[PDB]
């Protein structure tokens, strides 16, 4: 059975844990819990293939160099977290020693009205990296499966 | 004589104290003074009614649950303070145990040129909460009476 | 030989040192080095005049009141640094006891895709101060000579 090693990175509070727990357990963690298990496993069918997702949920700035693909997460109501993405991408480029790493840019908290990052800004950043941009809500589940499954489809192209 | 219990909330440095002192004393505090009295009282006539404003000027994150109406203040040159509004609104929703609380969204420092929050962004956030948006300058007095008097008119609808 | 006393100011990490080292030594400092010499000297020809640039590279918040002209630097991928410009300008206004100080607003890191400050936002802020806006990249050298030489041309108008 094929295993996909996914690593979730991005600034503190963007919803890395909430996104991963929504995917794995179909539950929204509505609080900020600073003691959540980093390692998640799930058997899923993606495009007719039974596979294992091995997910590492990292802390807002080892884990990195074992990763096959990366979710780079910011929050659409957190301009600083969007600006911080380049530093996370530079870290991934350094550990993978490549500018061709399977990666999805994730704009989380898309359920919230206080948007300070336009879809077009994030599309432009993702384009500059040669990666897809997907908006998600860990709260409503919008885009959550799409973000993780798209990352698997990006790993399959590597 | 009718008393209106107003509470001013929002991020550090957005001008909660400057706004309240401009309303009450017709003076602009041009410095950042970290030891300002939290409690203000003023007898005013609003729509022909002689009334008392009992204003609590809170610190950038009791006071809350006694409040009848809330000014949720950000600065139009402070994107983080605009993003922080949702956390202040969530706090008000928690203490008032209602999503129908008399509230005005205030975009302060509208005299400044370094605008990073568009009027339309703030209008959209206020719309999502079902509340008015008003821009103010504690410096020029623009919108200051309008912000506080509108909050009184919102309390009168509750 | 005419000496131009230039002072580079702005928030931590915007690239004040990278800009000054790119101008003086034609090298991009790709790391964040917290122990860089503050004082730079260079003999240059600007509009046919052989002159000395005496440059003071300040830390993200003496140096100030000796300055004849100021580069006020933010990063186009750092909204907070753009918002912080007004505080640096207010400091310059205080030490020079004038609202007519030779000054250029510099939008640095223009090579980066994660733009959160629009050119038009910065043009509007610069217009409000009566100063030019120039975009730079300490990395590619885009606009670097233009920023410093424009500041010299602003000092010559004082
Ligand atoms: N409204 C909304 N809130 C969200 C969403 N995702 C996360 N949150 C909220 O944002 C806060 C932080 O979420 P969390 O998953 O702990 O963030 P994190 O990126 O893992 N933080 P850290 O890096 O410190 O571990 C929580 O209160 C959570 O409920 C979302 O999509 N919508
Ligand atoms: N230009 C301008 N400056 C303002 C305006 N309102 C406040 N300020 C300035 O912003 C700074 C902070 O104001 P202040 O009222 O102390 O903010 P606060 O929200 O009460 N801060 P805290 O939460 O720490 O008590 C002061 O230097 C003040 O002069 C405004 O409308 N325009
Ligand atoms: N991509 C890019 N990076 C830049 C640019 N200018 C600076 N940097 C990077 O940004 C970081 C900070 O640069 P630095 O010059 O040290 O900033 P500073 O304004 O002097 N910081 P401080 O106020 O603490 O002294 C460095 O890693 C540097 O390589 C630029 O134009 N483009
Ligand atoms: Mg977490
Ligand atoms: Mg914007
Ligand atoms: Mg105060
Ligand atoms: Mg420096
Ligand atoms: Na890439
Ligand atoms: Na409401
Ligand atoms: Na000026």
Q: Which atom of ligand 1 approaches the CA of A138 most closely?
A: 31
Distance CA A153, CA A156 (A): 5
Neighbouring-strand partners of residue B50? B45
* Residue found by looking up tokens 């929504």 in the block: A22
Distance B11 CA to ligand 1 centre (A): 20
Alpha-carbon distance of B144 to B142, in angstroms, equals 6
Residue B109 CA to residue B114 CA, distance in Å, equals 10
Judged by a CB distance cut-off of 8 A, whether residue A119 touches chain C is: no
The four Cα atoms C28, C122, C41, C50 give a dihedral, to 10 degrees, of 110
φ/ψ region of A52 (left if φ > 0, alpha if ψ in -120 to 50, else beta) reads: beta
The pair phi, psi for residue C146, each rounded to 5°, is: -60, -45
3-state secondary structure chain B: CEEEEEEEECCCCCCHHHHHHHHHHCCCCCCCCCCCCCEEEEEEEECCEEEEEEEEECCCCCHHHHCCEEEEEEECCCHHHHHHHHHHHHHHHHHHCCCCCCEEEEEECCCCCCCCCCHHHHHHHHHHHCCCEEECCCCCCCCHHHHHHHHHHHHCCC
User: Ligand 1 test: best mutation among A7, A11, A17, most atoms within 8 Å of CB?
Assistant: A17
- Give the 3-state secondary structure of residue A53: strand
Structure tokens at A139: 């709260």
Task: Write the burial class of residue A122 (CB in 10 Å: 0-12 exposed, 13-18 middle, 19+ buried).
Answer: buried
What does the H/E/C string look like for chain C? Answer: CEEEEEEEECCCCCCHHHHHHHHHHCCCCCCCCCCCCCEEEEEEEECCEEEEEEEEECCCCCHHHHCCEEEEEEECCCHHHHHHHHHHHHHHHHHHCCCCCCEEEEEECCCCCCCCCCHHHHHHHHHHHCCCEEECCCCCCCCHHHHHHHHHHHHCCC
Regarding the beta carbon of A112 and ligand 1, being less than 6 Å apart is answered: yes
Q: State whether the beta carbon of B116 lies less than 6 angstroms from ligand 2.
A: no
B74 φ, ψ (degrees, to nearest 5)? -125, 170
Closest residue by Cα to residue B21 from B70, B52, B47, B55? B55
Query: Is the minimum distance from the CB of B89 to ligand 2 under 6 angstroms?
Result: no
Homologous superfamily of A2-157: P-loop containing nucleotide triphosphate hydrolases (3.40.50.300)
Distance CA C103, CA C92 (A): 9
A10-13 own/partner pairs: CB under 8 Å, 24+ apart: A10/A60, A10/A71, A10/A72, A10/A73, A10/A74, A10/A81, A10/A84, A10/A85, A10/A88, A10/A106, A11/A60, A11/A61, A11/A74, A11/A75, A11/A78, A11/A80, A11/A81, A11/A84, A12/A59, A12/A60, A13/A60, A13/A75, A13/A78, A13/A81
3 state SS of A16: helix
- Does C86 contact chain B (CB < 8 Å)? yes
Burial class of C153 by CB neighbour count within 10 A (0 to 12, 13 to 18, 19+) = middle
Rounded Cα gap, residues A126 and A40, in angstroms: 26
Rounded to whole angstroms, the Cα distance separating A147 from A135 reads 8
According to DSSP, residue A14 is labeled S
Task: Give the contacts of B91 (CB within 8 A, at least 6 positions apart).
Answer: B9, B61, B64
Instruction: Of C34, C2, C42, give the one whose Cα is nearest residue C18.
Output: C34
The verdict on a CB contact (< 8 Å) between C82 and B114 is yes
Tell me which H or E stretch contains A111: none
Joined tokens for residue A32: 């900020």
| Set of chain C residues whose Cβ sits within 8 Å of the Cβ of A129 | 113
Resolution rounded to one decimal, in angstroms:
1.5
Which tokens belong to C56?
């003071």
Q: Is B119 on the interface with A (CB under 8 A)?
A: no
Is there an atom of ligand 2 within 6 Å of B58 CB? no
In sequence order, which residues have a C-beta less than 8 Å from that of residue C42 and are 6 or more positions away? C23, C24, C52, C53, C55
- Token pair for residue C9? 């100011």
Structural tokens at position B1? 């004589």
* Helices and strands (H, E) in chain A, number of each type: 5, 6
The two structure tokens encoding residue A150: 């798209």
Burial class (CB in 10 A: 0-12, 13-18, 19+), A116: buried
Bridge-partner residues for C8, per DSSP?
Answer: C57, C71
The pair of three-digit structure tokens given for residue A120, joined into one six-digit string:
């077009």
């Amino acid at each position: 059975m094929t295993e996909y090693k996914l690593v979730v990175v991005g600034a503190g509070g963007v919803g890395k844990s909430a996104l991963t727990i929504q995917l794995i357990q179909n539950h929204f963690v509505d609080e900020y819990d600073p003691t959540i298990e980093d390692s998640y496993r799930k058997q899923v069918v993606i495009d007719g293939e039974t596979c294992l997702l091995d997910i590492l949920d990292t802390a807002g700035h080892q884990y990195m160099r074992t990763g096959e693909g990366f979710l780079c997460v910011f929050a659409i109501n957190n301009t600083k977290s969007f600006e911080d993405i380049h530093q996370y991408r530079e870290q991934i480029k350094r550990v993978k020693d490549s500018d061709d790493v399977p990666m999805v840019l994730v704009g989380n908290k898309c359920d919230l009205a206080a948007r300070t990052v336009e879809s077009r800004q994030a599309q432009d950043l993702a384009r500059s990296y040669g990666i897809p941009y997907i908006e998600t809500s860990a709260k409503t589940r919008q885009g959550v499966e799409d973000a993780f499954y798209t990352l698997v489809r990006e790993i399959r192209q590597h």
